Each structure stands twice: as structure tokens, then as C-alpha cells.
Design an enzyme around this catalytic site. Structure first.
Site, PDB file in Angstrom:
ATOM      1  N   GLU A 107      33.099   6.423  27.171  1.00 46.05           N
ATOM      2  CA  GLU A 107      32.476   7.548  27.844  1.00 46.05           C
ATOM      3  C   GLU A 107      33.257   8.806  27.469  1.00 46.05           C
ATOM      4  O   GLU A 107      34.483   8.763  27.312  1.00 46.05           O
ATOM      5  CB  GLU A 107      32.545   7.261  29.323  1.00 46.05           C
ATOM      6  CG  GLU A 107      31.912   8.241  30.288  1.00 46.05           C
ATOM      7  CD  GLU A 107      32.276   7.892  31.748  1.00 46.05           C
ATOM      8  OE1 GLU A 107      31.836   8.640  32.661  1.00 46.05           O
ATOM      9  OE2 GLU A 107      33.010   6.877  31.984  1.00 46.05           O
ATOM     10  N   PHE A 108      32.542   9.914  27.301  1.00 45.29           N
ATOM     11  CA  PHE A 108      33.143  11.173  26.948  1.00 45.29           C
ATOM     12  C   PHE A 108      33.230  12.053  28.205  1.00 45.29           C
ATOM     13  O   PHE A 108      32.216  12.527  28.707  1.00 45.29           O
ATOM     14  CB  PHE A 108      32.346  11.893  25.832  1.00 45.29           C
ATOM     15  CG  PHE A 108      32.820  13.332  25.572  1.00 45.29           C
ATOM     16  CD1 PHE A 108      34.152  13.590  25.260  1.00 45.29           C
ATOM     17  CD2 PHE A 108      31.955  14.426  25.729  1.00 45.29           C
ATOM     18  CE1 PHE A 108      34.610  14.893  25.033  1.00 45.29           C
ATOM     19  CE2 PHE A 108      32.415  15.732  25.516  1.00 45.29           C
ATOM     20  CZ  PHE A 108      33.738  15.966  25.150  1.00 45.29           C
ATOM     21  N   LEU A 109      34.451  12.306  28.674  1.00 42.65           N
ATOM     22  CA  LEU A 109      34.679  13.215  29.784  1.00 42.65           C
ATOM     23  C   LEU A 109      34.930  14.631  29.318  1.00 42.65           C
ATOM     24  O   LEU A 109      35.934  14.945  28.700  1.00 42.65           O
ATOM     25  CB  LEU A 109      35.771  12.686  30.721  1.00 42.65           C
ATOM     26  CG  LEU A 109      35.237  11.497  31.545  1.00 42.65           C
ATOM     27  CD1 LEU A 109      35.344  10.191  30.783  1.00 42.65           C
ATOM     28  CD2 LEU A 109      36.002  11.410  32.823  1.00 42.65           C
TER      29      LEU A 109
ATOM     30  N   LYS B 219      38.001   6.077  19.778  1.00 36.33           N
ATOM     31  CA  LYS B 219      39.359   5.924  19.331  1.00 36.33           C
ATOM     32  C   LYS B 219      39.293   5.027  18.102  1.00 36.33           C
ATOM     33  O   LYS B 219      38.588   4.038  18.118  1.00 36.33           O
ATOM     34  CB  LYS B 219      40.197   5.327  20.449  1.00 36.33           C
ATOM     35  CG  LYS B 219      41.709   5.411  20.244  1.00 36.33           C
ATOM     36  CD  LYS B 219      42.481   5.113  21.534  1.00 36.33           C
ATOM     37  CE  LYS B 219      43.981   4.993  21.323  1.00 36.33           C
ATOM     38  NZ  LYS B 219      44.547   6.115  20.526  1.00 36.33           N
TER      39      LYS B 219
ATOM     40  N   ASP C 177      51.422   3.581  33.376  1.00 36.94           N
ATOM     41  CA  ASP C 177      51.578   4.903  32.748  1.00 36.94           C
ATOM     42  C   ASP C 177      50.803   6.040  33.483  1.00 36.94           C
ATOM     43  O   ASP C 177      50.198   6.910  32.850  1.00 36.94           O
ATOM     44  CB  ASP C 177      51.179   4.780  31.270  1.00 36.94           C
ATOM     45  CG  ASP C 177      51.661   5.937  30.407  1.00 36.94           C
ATOM     46  OD1 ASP C 177      52.650   6.634  30.768  1.00 36.94           O
ATOM     47  OD2 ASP C 177      51.031   6.126  29.329  1.00 36.94           O
TER      48      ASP C 177
ATOM     49  N   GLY D 186      46.607   6.321  17.444  1.00 39.21           N
ATOM     50  CA  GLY D 186      45.341   6.484  16.722  1.00 39.21           C
ATOM     51  C   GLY D 186      44.773   7.882  16.912  1.00 39.21           C
ATOM     52  O   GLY D 186      45.269   8.643  17.751  1.00 39.21           O
TER      53      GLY D 186
HETATM   54  C1  LIG Z   1      42.372  11.900  23.469  1.00 38.58           C
HETATM   55  C2  LIG Z   1      41.525  12.043  24.745  1.00 38.58           C
HETATM   56  N1  LIG Z   1      40.599  10.900  25.070  1.00 38.58           N
HETATM   57  C3  LIG Z   1      40.861   9.532  24.797  1.00 38.58           C
HETATM   58  O1  LIG Z   1      42.012   9.110  24.145  1.00 38.58           O
HETATM   59  C4  LIG Z   1      39.856   8.469  25.237  1.00 38.58           C
HETATM   60  C5  LIG Z   1      40.134   7.032  24.906  1.00 38.58           C
HETATM   61  C6  LIG Z   1      41.241   6.442  25.453  1.00 38.58           C
HETATM   62  C7  LIG Z   1      41.491   5.120  25.144  1.00 38.58           C
HETATM   63  C8  LIG Z   1      40.640   4.436  24.291  1.00 38.58           C
HETATM   64 CL1  LIG Z   1      40.823   2.733  23.794  1.00 38.58          CL
HETATM   65  C9  LIG Z   1      39.549   5.054  23.750  1.00 38.58           C
HETATM   66  C10 LIG Z   1      39.277   6.362  24.030  1.00 38.58           C
HETATM   67 CL2  LIG Z   1      37.805   6.973  23.233  1.00 38.58          CL
HETATM   68  C11 LIG Z   1      38.662   8.799  25.927  1.00 38.58           C
HETATM   69  C12 LIG Z   1      38.467  10.225  26.158  1.00 38.58           C
HETATM   70  C13 LIG Z   1      37.317  10.582  26.809  1.00 38.58           C
HETATM   71  N2  LIG Z   1      37.061  11.887  27.073  1.00 38.58           N
HETATM   72  C14 LIG Z   1      37.964  12.832  26.698  1.00 38.58           C
HETATM   73  N3  LIG Z   1      37.685  14.222  26.991  1.00 38.58           N
HETATM   74  C15 LIG Z   1      38.495  15.366  26.575  1.00 38.58           C
HETATM   75  C16 LIG Z   1      37.879  16.621  26.526  1.00 38.58           C
HETATM   76  C17 LIG Z   1      38.587  17.785  26.171  1.00 38.58           C
HETATM   77  C18 LIG Z   1      39.922  17.679  25.869  1.00 38.58           C
HETATM   78  N4  LIG Z   1      40.673  18.878  25.483  1.00 38.58           N
HETATM   79  C19 LIG Z   1      40.405  20.159  26.127  1.00 38.58           C
HETATM   80  C20 LIG Z   1      41.483  21.241  25.931  1.00 38.58           C
HETATM   81  N5  LIG Z   1      42.506  20.948  24.933  1.00 38.58           N
HETATM   82  C21 LIG Z   1      42.686  19.578  24.456  1.00 38.58           C
HETATM   83  C22 LIG Z   1      41.335  18.929  24.175  1.00 38.58           C
HETATM   84  C23 LIG Z   1      40.535  16.427  25.939  1.00 38.58           C
HETATM   85  F1  LIG Z   1      41.843  16.240  25.682  1.00 38.58           F
HETATM   86  C24 LIG Z   1      39.841  15.280  26.297  1.00 38.58           C
HETATM   87  N6  LIG Z   1      39.092  12.446  26.062  1.00 38.58           N
HETATM   88  C25 LIG Z   1      39.378  11.193  25.760  1.00 38.58           C
END
Ligand SMILES: CCn1c(=O)c(-c2ccc(Cl)cc2Cl)cc2cnc(Nc3ccc(N4CCNCC4)c(F)c3)nc21
Length: 290
Positions: free
Chosen positions: A97-99, A51, A141, A34
Site C-alpha cells: 500500500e502507498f501511504l 521495495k 524498531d 533496498g
Molecule cells: C521508503 C518508504 N516506504 C517503504 O519503505 C514501504 C515498504 C516498507 C517495507 C517493505 Cl517490504 C516494502 C515497502 Cl514498499 C512502504 C511505503 C509506503 N508508503 C510510503 N509513503 C511515503 C510518501 C512520501 C515520503 N516522502 C515525503 C517527504 N520526503 C521523503 C519522501 C515517504 F518517505 C514515504 N513509503 C513507504
């Protein structure tokens, strides 16, 4: 066929449209299962992760349940918090949550970590894995890619697409899933396997933090996988950058005999982890700080 999945979801998901309170969607990333987006919450001004995935075009649909059904409501400081899920057309959206700090995988490739910072990451991941393992959840994983960082330098485990719940009566799984370089020996053996495959994968992650890559990463995945099965515990290419303390810790994770391999419980006691620094020790390693 597909709308049977749709119907089961409607039991689980919160109803209503999350567009009633979310907007300014922006793409972060994608890993086949996704797209992932950032979005603002109107009422509060906060950012969340979302997502989204079309039900019909999922292929391992089975796995889609596993994140939502397992991850729903687990309370842990070192795990990524799911907020709600929604049914929006023929699409499941999951709001999390947004990291801000991103994945650890960005850091290990570009820089090299010291032991304090390594100990912190390991500590966090072991805290989370102990509980998950205390309730039957094998992550299946573990790797730098599935670790996320807050701007505080806090470490949280995520990416449960592949997780499995396990019990007193059936205490193992068979299914060949994971990322090759990180998969345990028994998992490539096609043997039954328990929650200890997390621990091997963690060990491989330590080798990621010290070496920048896991073992056999030059090879193809099929080659590397026999190599892990057949041959000895892989070794640190940079053995000279590494404490005897960490070297011990590591030797209790990369045990090829699964029986005598250690456990989140056990490992949480080890002297290596007392070197762990606070969240602030991690901050400097990030792309805003590099
Ligand atoms: C796809 C990543 N991701 C998820 O898949 C999910 C997620 C996973 C499983 C589900 Cl069921 C729903 C979600 Cl919503 C939560 C998530 C939260 N916080 C973040 N922060 C984040 C901040 C910066 C970058 N980058 C910086 C530099 N270059 C590349 C881009 C980064 F890859 C990530 N990423 C998430």
C-alpha cells in the site's frame, strides 16, 4: 550459497512478472536494505509502493525473510498492507500500500504536536502493537520513522525488517537489533528480552513528538546506549508543554524495570488516550498543509 535463498522465495512469492501490470516507476527512498519506488497499476490506475532488493548483495539476508514471511496476510487497519511479492531475476520485489502522507519523522522535526494529535498516534500504534503482541510479534524498531500517514490522517505502522516471532516455549530474543536512541535497557544489557521493548521505544517516540528528538541525540550511538542502560529514565526537555495526564502515561512506558513496565493491552485503557482526536486532527500537520 545465495540461490538456496532464491529457491525458498519461489515457494512464497506470487509467480509471474509484476511488470505485466505495473509501470511508471519513481524512486521514493532507500535505507540500505533496498530501493523503494512508486508505480502505477495499469488495470486500475492506482499507486503502489515497491521495495526491490537484489538477493546476492543483501548482507543480513536473514531479515529479508522476516518482513515477507511475517507481514504476509496480517489484517490490521493500523498496519501497512503487503499486496504480493514477486521473484524478478535475482531480485525480490515487494508490493505494498502507498501511504501518501509519508513518515511521522518529517512532522516531528519541523513542527510540534498537540496532545490530541499525540494521543491519536499513540492510540493507533497501541491498537496495532496489541494484536502483534497477541500473536507473538515484537516489532523491535518503533520510532517516528516507522510510522506512516494516509492523506486522511490515519496512522499505520510499518518497517518490520527487524521483527521477530515469539512463542510460549521460547518467549524472548537475544539479538542486539534496533535503533540505538530508541533501544530498551535490557536490549543493550544483552539480556533476554520480550515484547515490552516495543513499549519503551514507543515512550521514546512520545518524547520525539513533544521534544522533536529523542534523548541523547547529540551524542554518538555508542555513548547514548550506555547512558540509556546506566542512567535513569530519560525526561522531557519540554516538561512545561505537557499534561499531567500525558506525563503519567509516559511514566508507565519508560519503566527501566521490564517486569513492571506496562503493556499494549494495559495502556489501551489509560485516560490519556481518551484525548485522542480523529484522523482529521492530524492532516494540518502535513507538508502540504504546513
Ligand atoms: C521508503 C518508504 N516506504 C517503504 O519503505 C514501504 C515498504 C516498507 C517495507 C517493505 Cl517490504 C516494502 C515497502 Cl514498499 C512502504 C511505503 C509506503 N508508503 C510510503 N509513503 C511515503 C510518501 C512520501 C515520503 N516522502 C515525503 C517527504 N520526503 C521523503 C519522501 C515517504 F518517505 C514515504 N513509503 C513507504
Amino acid at each position: 550459497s545465495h540461490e538456496q535463498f532464491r529457491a525458498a522465495l519461489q515457494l512464497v512469492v506470487d509467480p509471474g512478472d509484476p511488470r505485466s501490470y505495473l509501470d511508471n516507476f519513481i524512486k521514493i527512498g532507500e535505507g540500505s536494505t533496498g530501493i523503494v519506488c512508486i508505480a502505477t497499476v495499469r488495470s486500475s490506475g492506482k499507486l503502489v509502493a515497491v521495495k526491490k532488493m537484489d538477493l546476492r548483495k543483501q548482507q543480513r539476508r536473514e531479515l529479508l525473510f522476516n518482513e515477507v514471511v511475517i507481514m504476509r496476510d496480517y489484517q490490521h487497519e493500523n498496519v501497512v498492507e503487503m499486496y504480493n511479492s514477486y521473484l524478478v531475476g535475482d531480485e525480490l520485489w515487494v508490493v505494498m500500500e502507498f501511504l501518501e502522507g509519508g513518515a511521522l519523522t518529517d512532522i516531528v522535526t519541523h513542527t510540534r504536536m498537540n496532545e490530541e494529535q499525540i494521543a491519536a498516534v499513540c492510540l493507533a500504534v497501541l491498537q496495532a502493537l496489541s494484536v502483534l503482541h497477541a500473536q507473538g510479534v515484537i516489532h523491535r524498531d518503533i520510532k517516528s520513522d516507522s510510522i506512516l500517514l494516509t492523506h486522511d490522517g490515519r496512522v499505520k505502522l510499518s518497517d518490520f525488517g527487524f521483527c521477530a516471532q515469539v512463542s510460549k516455549e521460547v518467549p524472548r530474543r537475544k539479538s542486539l537489533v534496533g535503533t540505538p536512541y530508541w533501544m530498551a535497557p535490557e536490549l543493550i544489557s544483552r539480556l533476554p528480552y520480550g515484547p515490552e521493548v516495543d513499549i519503551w521505544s514507543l515512550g521514546i517516540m512520545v518524547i520525539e513528538m513533544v521534544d522533536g528528538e529523542p534523548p541523547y541525540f547529540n551524542e554518538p550511538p555508542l555513548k547514548a546506549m550506555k547512558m540509556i542502560r546506566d542512567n535513569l529514565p530519560p525526561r522531557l526537555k519540554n516538561l512545561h508543554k505537557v499534561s499531567p495526564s500525558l506525563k503519567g502515561f509516559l511514566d508507565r512506558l519508560l519503566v527501566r524495570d521490564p517486569a513492571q513496565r506496562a503493556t499494549a493491552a494495559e495502556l489501551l485503557k489509560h485516560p490519556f488516550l481518551a484525548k485522542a482526536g480523529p484522523p482529521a486532527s492530524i492532516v494540518p500537520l502535513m507538508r502540504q498543509n504546513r
